[PDB]
Design a protein around this motif. Structure first.
Motif, PDB file in Angstrom:
ATOM      1  N   UNK A  90       0.828  -1.201   0.000  1.00  0.00           N
ATOM      2  CA  UNK A  90       0.000   0.000   0.000  1.00  0.00           C
ATOM      3  C   UNK A  90       0.866   1.256   0.000  1.00  0.00           C
ATOM      4  N   UNK A  91       0.328   2.337  -0.554  1.00  0.00           N
ATOM      5  CA  UNK A  91       1.048   3.602  -0.618  1.00  0.00           C
ATOM      6  C   UNK A  91       1.684   3.935   0.728  1.00  0.00           C
ATOM      7  N   UNK A  92       0.846   4.152   1.736  1.00  0.00           N
ATOM      8  CA  UNK A  92       1.326   4.477   3.073  1.00  0.00           C
ATOM      9  C   UNK A  92       2.447   3.535   3.498  1.00  0.00           C
ATOM     10  N   UNK A  93       2.195   2.234   3.389  1.00  0.00           N
ATOM     11  CA  UNK A  93       3.192   1.250   3.764  1.00  0.00           C
ATOM     12  C   UNK A  93       4.584   1.627   3.296  1.00  0.00           C
ATOM     13  N   UNK A  94       4.758   1.724   1.982  1.00  0.00           N
ATOM     14  CA  UNK A  94       6.050   2.076   1.407  1.00  0.00           C
ATOM     15  C   UNK A  94       6.614   3.333   2.064  1.00  0.00           C
ATOM     16  N   UNK A  95       5.774   4.354   2.194  1.00  0.00           N
ATOM     17  CA  UNK A  95       6.187   5.610   2.807  1.00  0.00           C
ATOM     18  C   UNK A  95       6.918   5.365   4.122  1.00  0.00           C
ATOM     19  N   UNK A  96       6.396   4.439   4.921  1.00  0.00           N
ATOM     20  CA  UNK A  96       7.012   4.127   6.197  1.00  0.00           C
ATOM     21  C   UNK A  96       8.461   3.705   6.054  1.00  0.00           C
ATOM     22  N   UNK A  97       8.751   2.934   5.010  1.00  0.00           N
ATOM     23  CA  UNK A  97      10.108   2.460   4.763  1.00  0.00           C
ATOM     24  C   UNK A  97      11.042   3.626   4.454  1.00  0.00           C
ATOM     25  N   UNK A  98      10.618   4.492   3.539  1.00  0.00           N
ATOM     26  CA  UNK A  98      11.417   5.648   3.152  1.00  0.00           C
ATOM     27  C   UNK A  98      11.727   6.525   4.361  1.00  0.00           C
ATOM     28  N   UNK A  99      10.686   6.879   5.109  1.00  0.00           N
ATOM     29  CA  UNK A  99      10.846   7.714   6.294  1.00  0.00           C
ATOM     30  C   UNK A  99      11.776   7.050   7.305  1.00  0.00           C
ATOM     31  N   UNK A 100      11.358   5.897   7.817  1.00  0.00           N
ATOM     32  CA  UNK A 100      12.153   5.164   8.795  1.00  0.00           C
ATOM     33  C   UNK A 100      13.641   5.270   8.476  1.00  0.00           C
ATOM     34  N   UNK A 101      13.994   4.997   7.225  1.00  0.00           N
ATOM     35  CA  UNK A 101      15.384   5.063   6.788  1.00  0.00           C
ATOM     36  C   UNK A 101      15.960   6.457   7.014  1.00  0.00           C
ATOM     37  N   UNK A 102      15.166   7.477   6.707  1.00  0.00           N
ATOM     38  CA  UNK A 102      15.598   8.859   6.876  1.00  0.00           C
ATOM     39  C   UNK A 102      15.772   9.199   8.353  1.00  0.00           C
ATOM     40  N   UNK A 103      14.711   8.996   9.129  1.00  0.00           N
ATOM     41  CA  UNK A 103      14.744   9.281  10.559  1.00  0.00           C
ATOM     42  C   UNK A 103      16.076   8.853  11.168  1.00  0.00           C
ATOM     43  N   UNK A 104      16.547   7.673  10.776  1.00  0.00           N
ATOM     44  CA  UNK A 104      17.809   7.149  11.285  1.00  0.00           C
ATOM     45  C   UNK A 104      18.991   7.936  10.725  1.00  0.00           C
ATOM     46  N   UNK A 105      19.205   7.820   9.419  1.00  0.00           N
ATOM     47  CA  UNK A 105      20.300   8.520   8.758  1.00  0.00           C
ATOM     48  C   UNK A 105      20.324   9.992   9.157  1.00  0.00           C
ATOM     49  N   UNK A 106      19.182  10.497   9.611  1.00  0.00           N
ATOM     50  CA  UNK A 106      19.073  11.890  10.029  1.00  0.00           C
ATOM     51  C   UNK A 106      19.359  12.034  11.520  1.00  0.00           C
ATOM     52  N   UNK A 107      18.808  11.124  12.314  1.00  0.00           N
ATOM     53  CA  UNK A 107      19.004  11.150  13.758  1.00  0.00           C
ATOM     54  C   UNK A 107      20.461  10.875  14.114  1.00  0.00           C
ATOM     55  N   UNK A 108      20.989   9.763  13.613  1.00  0.00           N
ATOM     56  CA  UNK A 108      22.372   9.386  13.879  1.00  0.00           C
ATOM     57  C   UNK A 108      23.322  10.542  13.592  1.00  0.00           C
ATOM     58  N   UNK A 109      23.065  11.257  12.502  1.00  0.00           N
ATOM     59  CA  UNK A 109      23.897  12.391  12.117  1.00  0.00           C
ATOM     60  C   UNK A 109      23.704  13.559  13.078  1.00  0.00           C
ATOM     61  N   UNK A 110      22.450  13.828  13.429  1.00  0.00           N
ATOM     62  CA  UNK A 110      22.129  14.919  14.341  1.00  0.00           C
ATOM     63  C   UNK A 110      22.984  14.853  15.601  1.00  0.00           C
ATOM     64  N   UNK A 111      22.918  13.722  16.296  1.00  0.00           N
ATOM     65  CA  UNK A 111      23.687  13.531  17.520  1.00  0.00           C
ATOM     66  C   UNK A 111      24.902  12.644  17.268  1.00  0.00           C
ATOM     67  N   UNK A 112      24.648  11.373  16.976  1.00  0.00           N
ATOM     68  CA  UNK A 112      25.719  10.420  16.711  1.00  0.00           C
ATOM     69  C   UNK A 112      26.581  10.880  15.540  1.00  0.00           C
TER      70      UNK A 112
END
Length: 112
Positions: A90-112
């Motif tokens: 489903x549309x939403x479903x896929x979206x979750x994958x894209x975001x999740x990946x970002x949240x990390x690559x973004x979070x880790x960089x923010x602090x880590x």
């Protein structure tokens, strides 16, 4: 240990940033708006804690999150529920994958 280099608000301030960007993602709208329980066929039943960017935001600024941990717990949960209720197909479903990946690559960089 001694791995923190954080304060009280400073840490929170950042959370506001990451949230913003994500909130403006081509695949972050699936949460931007709350899931209408009345419309959706039994949503709360499947989702124990139906969170959303619209809410997390008000809570963030309101000062509901005492630290990063909490703030994160909510975020990570936002994409989690989706993966459960929605399907990668489903549309939403896929979206979750894209975001999740970002949240990390973004979070880790923010602090880590």
């Amino acid at each position: 240990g001694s791995s923190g280099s954080s304060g009280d608000s400073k840490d929170l301030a950042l959370c506001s940033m990451i949230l913003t960007e994500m909130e403006t993602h081509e695949d972050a709208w699936p949460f931007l708006l709350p899931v209408n329980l009345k419309l959706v066929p039994g949503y709360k039943k499947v989702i124990k804690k139906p969170m959303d960017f619209s809410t997390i935001r008000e809570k963030l600024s309101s000062g509901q999150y005492p630290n990063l941990e909490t703030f994160a717990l909510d975020v990570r949960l936002v994409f989690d529920n989706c993966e459960t209720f929605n399907e990668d197909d489903s549309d939403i479903g896929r979206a979750g994958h894209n975001m999740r990946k970002y949240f990390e690559k973004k979070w880790t960089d923010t602090f880590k």
